[model samples]
Target: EGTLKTTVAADGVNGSSEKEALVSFENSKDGVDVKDTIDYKDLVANEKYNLTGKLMHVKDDGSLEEVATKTTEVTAVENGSGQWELDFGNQKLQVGEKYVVFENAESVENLIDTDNNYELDTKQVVKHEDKNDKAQTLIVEKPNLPEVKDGTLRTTVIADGVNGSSEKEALVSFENSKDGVDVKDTINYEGLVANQNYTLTGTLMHVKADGSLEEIATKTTNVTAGENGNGTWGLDFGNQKLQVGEKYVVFENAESVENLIDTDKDYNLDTKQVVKHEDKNDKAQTLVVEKP
Candidate 1:
């Protein structure tokens, strides 16, 4: 008994719809270069079979245009077990192009769709004495999305005590008010692009009873990451900062600082707050200063 089966092969391998090749738009400037194949098994030994295919471009108006035609002759090695292959090497394709492989009918040089309305339903099959027709559609598509990374901002109070105050105390009677309070801060950032420059702005705000925030001052700085994609920024509020009985909060962005303020009027500085970062919207809290 003789057996005959036909299949379409894409990228030099036999595959079905699930193994469709991806033609990236960015990398396909010279058109999509790929090897098209036709696989067949159990044909008459030492016989030649002509395998033909068409590369059709789907137009904007849903019309199909034949852009390329490929035909190759295959000689079967065995009738029962060995498989034979025909190759259309390194064919160019477009984004909306579809390729269909089938057996060439008797005496026909090439087939054309006179109606220009041949749907690639993959159901067209004509079996001959020793050859069978096969239809396969290879689709071209765009690339995938970029990987998401964790964006972070960490804060540390470098100096939070009064300035010019030492641990040692004087035995003699003395009275004096410090010149200013020591306020220094550092913010470390991670999960950003390496060797990139970013401009970061900070705003000092005061939350009031009427659920309104007042912007006291603002500071700006530049941060540049290293090869490890991590960097640190330090800020300083000059002497005599955070006067008595005043609540001050440090936020990340000046434009979005209004939303970060606690309008409830019952806010604390110790709790973690959410603030924006430079350029990119980040999720992290800045520092808060409240002096008794």
Candidate 2:
């Protein structure tokens, strides 16, 4: 949702403290699928630098607090190559939660800056030059990450919506809201935490005279929320007279997620019919109640 800029120069000194070298990080949720990215420039020489980068979790006070620290080796080059483009992956931090990454403070000067300089006119750092600035600090931060925008969950009747059943059986048909949606476990998705994997669990049953489910039938499925909230799943049931006035319900799958598509009436598969009463053939024998 925002950008952060930082810079580092060899020999521990640069011509400008303007922090002009822009390292970009972006964050957002397009209804779902959290996305983030970072942009930076290569600022090291073509040699080994004992990298001690620290990834910090944002504290409630909004301060940089150390959480994870890593030590790796990376080689950087001068303008001889391309700029650095790092993919930070995708995820949503809680509303007040965020993270940051940068050079660890333990040995901020572990980098061997022999040939690096952001200053255009000045000479680059050399082996014989003062090595006091062996420190390289680069920071990428996301604070108070925004929550998912308003979500959507709509179902349509494409003939198999719910009530469509055959003479032998009937099944509940589902619509695909996304391409790769696999609902295994759940966050009780109120539309699924916007690109999160949540379990879709719920009960399907008929209401009893006591206003309770009769031995509630359970259901579990996976929902990989995609396409801004649109999908379907059909239930298959064997023969049972599909009564016209009978009603059924599919309650909340996850704890917090209610049945978004359950209709007040049953799927309306079929209805029984009663034939006519009085017939012309019975008129001839109507008065024949014999006493004999």
Candidate 3:
């Protein structure tokens, strides 16, 4: 009988110790069971293996192709770890916020450290899961990275007072680019006349993706401005334009917004460059600070 070899790897799912990786095989013809493993900490990189299965694909006749397979050897690089190698031509990586199971992995090939630290991780390089369908392909993100630092800002009203109606009900939201390169918002001054060319006063700024506040510029908008505003704001490229998918941050207490201002006072303008969510379905409101 010709002898066959098998390999194993990490799931990144179903939580387990990555210090050692193993695989199991049962021969149908000889009622035999076997298993193997490798030390992933010293696992080699840039090498490919008989890994990854194409659960789905295209046929030459324009039909569809589907098969079950597992991933292969895993290599831990400088700042990250992955289940791709040369024999498979290197799988394209994409970083994101979703992490799921690799059901198609046949032979697992990663062995982490006993302490589960990446720097001192040990890994085995061989056939594990399939590199085909069912494996998470895009989430090439860094899991060990520390949280993004947050900056604080206080809300203030320099006008009539909180609109008992608006200020009591605060709403917030923010958006950023894919790789954290850019961030912005296209704040719509609601109930505004469609054709009116209203000029907005105040300074709109934010902390850009790169976290640089220098060379900060100045700009205005179409809703309202200040009793007087300042050149103070965030990564403000300071263009003063508001369009859908565009970013805007206005913080000046001078020019009172015509129809949107909370005349009663409560709701003021206090924010930084990063706002997480603005999910309020109650009533449309506005914020202006230092309104003269």
Candidate 4:
């Protein structure tokens, strides 16, 4: 045979038409040759073309392994240009998910078949590049602690990420108490004498919930006398247990003095007391207990 053209109609039968054309010939003495084609008409307007098929995975043994199969039926629509179109709206394909597309025909003779016709493995899909190209981030830096005199602990932390041209400073204060009594006077003796050496002493007692003191601790700081007798004493009390509403006494005594003026000659000390109390918002207070 040479060629063939066939016209099929479905007017009033199902409101649509389907055409199939076939050509037949003899291949050899015992073989046959055939070619077929199908045309689907009057499909749903403004719809997508849905095809379905099976998915398979190939194994190392050169054998095919059946995985999954699915059918997707899509409708075809005609645009104003008189052209039929298959509008697949926002088709989302997931990674590692397999899919298949089948031919829009009635019989196996017109099926569009291929080696991958049964399976479309999603492993071949690639990930977007922008998601993995993000910029590197920097970490925040901390400040170093300053050196203070002996027999005293002076600890401080500086504020970071401030305005480049501004001078940021932190105010530090001290307080002391003993046996539930304020003894700040003994620590601040001589009012921080200038050009003099002093030994700071104190017992930071831990106040318990039952209004009792336990594990009494002691710490010392050295204050050097400077001009106007003002200098900071550095001290570390180690890891002392502290509780809310506890009391600790802090005192300072001049070890030696040279060219001292406006300073307490008899080591006349200045003192202040601090009570551990919770603020109205239920936060720990460093100094000065406020009544709720």
Candidate 5:
């Protein structure tokens, strides 16, 4: 007579599926003609069991191919929402990649489409494989009147070649009025330059209703020709300054007081009161008046 020892091995180390365990011992033989029986008492029942799986890339014609492989553990648990929560761990699925899952002999339910069942319900699914796919894009529809908050204003000048010279200086003034009310006068200068185009940049400082100064809005423009030659140039106010009830003024530099007196000596000096003139000699010109 011979003594015999029996050994049982399952698809999984700890437990086995019914199909796997049954087929494993189907062709086995022992000295005493013994039969392998799977005892449910030694296995975990009702409780979820975690199993590992793999992923594969699928083609457009329903053909499958292995691209990249990864291992993930998932558990089949009873979810409160009348469905089983096949939790595939805490893994993030790529948006456009293809994947698949497989186990030795256990059946699996793909939970990918669970999101469409409920409005606010979230779903987690296993990604067995992935392929490089194009992502969808979102287009924004703009409104007729674009969204805008506070408005602004800006002023600029471009003086290139004028009066047969580029290095020319001129006085620029800005006059603004609203509701028949005369506002303050602002002045600036076009600096000396060579025979080339130039740009003058400045800002519009707002005065609030309480008489306090507000933020400043700036702008710039290229000066193609100084006085007469025309290229193409205008002040850019960035569309914020086009609102109604606002006014603005721009002008070239004027001659100084001395230059006005001597340059237009033939004309009545009192009549040309606004003309500016430069005092090159720096001499103190005095005026004596007799009053009764």
Candidate 6:
């Protein structure tokens, strides 16, 4: 009858690929919100609890593929209860059906029971519908793109940058940084044809009231597909500091005879989340800079 039990929030267990689940838990039986229902209060105040959270892909056969892993610690403890959260990092999940599995260090000596010392639950991660079939899709997940605020840049996540291609997968994002300075950038590509060559271009542009676009500047890079069609590229705007009121267009093309990987793609951006589609007749979307 000695079992350390935990419960995951019904609404909190699922998250999209861009928005990883912010898993919430409480050491209780019925998982009621009140404090008196907490039955598994074996926490030791000020003692750090190490944990490993895995973003597990639930395969068609029901087997799991460890897509990504993240670690977090329970530092702040309640007086007589167990409650905590775990961030699975920005690993993509909407591509396929998935769930989160957790494992903790069992060797540590704590007041908690053995069952509570390890995996908490196999909570599912939500997935989005794939309406389109082609690989011409783009979503920005980093640099809080098109928006600069308080003299600083935001974490722009190209949610589907260079996406939609079974033979190609790439992520392009900008690190958090301040304006008037160079920000770290990542153009990581994977699931590509090995030993192949690819090209990606980011073009800064400005839109006019007359439905016209003005090209401000452009940066391009090439990546040779590795053993697994995986590699990285670079982007530098000649040390140009990004500012408000700027827009961008990015896409990928093959250096060989293969067609474009992500350009001519149609997507709609809502609060930085791009939804891939062909509704606009395969027209590429533009990302505009914003405040906040």
lDDT of each: 0.44, 0.30, 0.27, 0.27, 0.25, 0.36
Better of 1 and 2 by TM-score: 1
TM-score rank, highest first?
Answer: 1, 2, 6, 4, 3, 5
Superposition error at 14 for model 1 (Å): 13
| Model 1 lDDT tens row, 88-199 | 5555665444544443422122222345577322212223221112234555544332221354656543324422112221111111113434455456766654554555
- Answer with 1 or 4, whichever has the higher TM-score: 1
Using all chains and alpha carbons, the TM-scores for the candidates as numbered come to: 0.40, 0.30, 0.19, 0.22, 0.17, 0.26
> After TM-score superposition, what is the CA distance of residue 281 in candidate 5 from its true location, in Å?
42
Model 4 clash tally? 35
User: After best superposition, candidate 1 residue 114: deviation in angstroms?
Assistant: 28
TM-score: the better of candidates 5 and 6: 6
Model 6's number of clashes is: 23
RMSD of each: 13.5, 19.7, 23.1, 27.8, 27.9, 24.7
Q: Clashes in each model (backbone N, CA, C under 3 Å)? A: 1, 19, 60, 35, 24, 23
Residue 81 error for model 6, in Å? Answer: 1.6
Model 1 regions lying over 4 Å from their true place: 1-25, 29-52, 55-106, 109-146, 158-183, 190-198, 208-211, 225-231, 236-243, 253-292
Q: What is the lDDT of candidate 4?
A: 0.27
**Residue ranges of candidate 3 with Cα displaced over 4 Å:** 6-86, 93-152, 155-292
Clash list (residue pairs), candidate 1: 180-240
Tens-digit lDDT track for model 6 on 1-292?
Answer: 1112222222334333344333232212223111101122444445555544444455658675675565554442555246555444343333223344433422133443446657543221212112121111112222111221111111121322332222221222344213332322344554445565555555544445555656656666665656645555555544445444443433323332243232322311232112111111112333334444
User: Could you give me the TM-score of model 4 versus the true structure?
Assistant: 0.22
Candidate 1's clash total is 1
Give stretches of model 4 more than 4 Å off. Answer: 1-190, 210-215, 241-292
Name the better of 1 and 6 by TM-score: 1
Best candidate per TM-score, number? 1
Residue by residue across 245-276, what tens digits does model 2's lDDT show? 33333333322132222133332213211111
